[PDB]
């Protein structure tokens, strides 16, 4: 199975996403209060980054790929 | 002309509500005439360098610094 490779802002897909969570707007929030978490980090929540960062990843797109491999709960209140 | 009462800043298309409350002037943006991008990704869109620049002026003022 292939789509192909996909090109920056469109990656990753948004349906791979969605199965992390439960809708669009949760998935907003969720990379979102982690972007904040991680950029915090860099100017010491403090945790991650948690998969290898390419040099100057936003780290909304850091949050994205986290969430694709299901690295963070990712509890809803 | 008539002079423009308290009533004549809430009432009209110019009063509070639709010139100021729910619709106002924005920081961070612009705008110009559009051409067609026919060498675009669908999630691509040509920005002016120009225009690129100013809109994200205090951005690249701090990674430049």
Same mark, same amino acid.
Request: one cysteine or more.
């Given at each position: 199975?292939?789509?192909?490779?996909?090109?920056?802002?469109?990656?990753?897909?948004?349906?791979?996403?969605?199965?992390?969570?439960?809708?669009?707007?949760?998935?907003?929030?969720?990379?979102?209060?982690?972007?904040? %978490?991680?950029?915090?980090?860099?100017? %010491?929540?403090?945790?991650?980054?948690?998969?290898?960062?390419?040099? %100057?990843?936003?780290?909304?797109?850091?949050?994205?790929?986290?969430?694709?491999?299901?690295?963070?709960?990712?509890?809803?209140? | 002309?008539?002079?423009?009462?308290?009533?004549?800043?809430?009432?009209?298309?110019?009063?509070?509500?639709?010139?100021?409350?729910?619709?106002?002037?924005?920081?961070?943006?612009?705008?110009?005439?559009?051409?067609?991008?026919?060498?675009?990704?669908?999630?691509?869109?040509?920005?002016?360098?120009?225009?690129?620049?100013?809109?994200?002026?205090?951005?690249?003022?701090?990674?430049?610094?």
């Amino acid at each position: 199975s292939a789509y192909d490779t996909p090109l920056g802002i469109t990656n990753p897909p948004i349906d791979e996403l969605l199965s992390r969570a439960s809708s669009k707007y949760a998935l907003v929030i969720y990379a979102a209060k982690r972007a904040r %978490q991680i950029n915090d980090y860099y100017n %010491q929540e403090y945790v991650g980054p948690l998969v290898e960062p390419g040099l %100057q990843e936003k780290p909304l797109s850091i949050a994205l790929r986290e969430i694709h491999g299901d690295l963070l709960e990712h509890t809803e209140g | 002309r008539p002079l423009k009462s308290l009533s004549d800043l809430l009432k009209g298309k110019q009063g509070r509500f639709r010139q100021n409350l729910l619709g106002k002037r924005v920081d961070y943006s612009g705008r110009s005439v559009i051409v067609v991008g026919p060498q675009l990704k669908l999630h691509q869109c040509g920005l002016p360098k120009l225009m690129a620049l100013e809109l994200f002026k205090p951005f690249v003022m701090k990674r430049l610094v």
